[PDB]
Amino acid sequence: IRKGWLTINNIGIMKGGSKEYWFVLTAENLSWYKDDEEKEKKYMLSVDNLKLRDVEKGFMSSKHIFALFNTEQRNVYKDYRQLELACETQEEVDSWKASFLRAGVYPE
């Protein structure tokens, strides 16, 4: 339902460091790509069995941050941290959060 650039702050330490990925969100799944060519299909998350949260109060304010997480089903991202997603502006974060909620991501 939505396509665009989206930064991930929590990436495995072996390949860690905040990185920007091309992200496609649809009703069924979350698809991550290296670039807007939409070729790699490196990894994905299921829309169902996910929860959407705001970032911790007092956390870094250099980026507009929100996170995807879960505790009830085995649909969790790599067990390193909660999937912290970030954007340059608040509008992009709100757009992504709304798209996730429409897709079927449970709020909080």
Nearest-angstrom CA–CA distance, 71 and 56: 17
What phi and psi values does residue 14 have, to the nearest 5 degrees?
A: -55, -30
**Mode of pairing for the β-strands spanning 29-33 and 19-25:** antiparallel
| Beta-bridge mates of residue 73 | none
Which experimental method was this entry solved with?
cryo-EM
H helix or E strand, kind and range, residue 102? helix 90-103
Determine the Cα–Cα distance for residues 81 and 67; give it in Å rounded to an integer: 10
Q: Which of 16, 23, 60 is nearest to 40 (CA)?
A: 23
Closest CA to 11 of 73, 76, 78: 78
Task: Give the resolution in Å.
Answer: 3.3
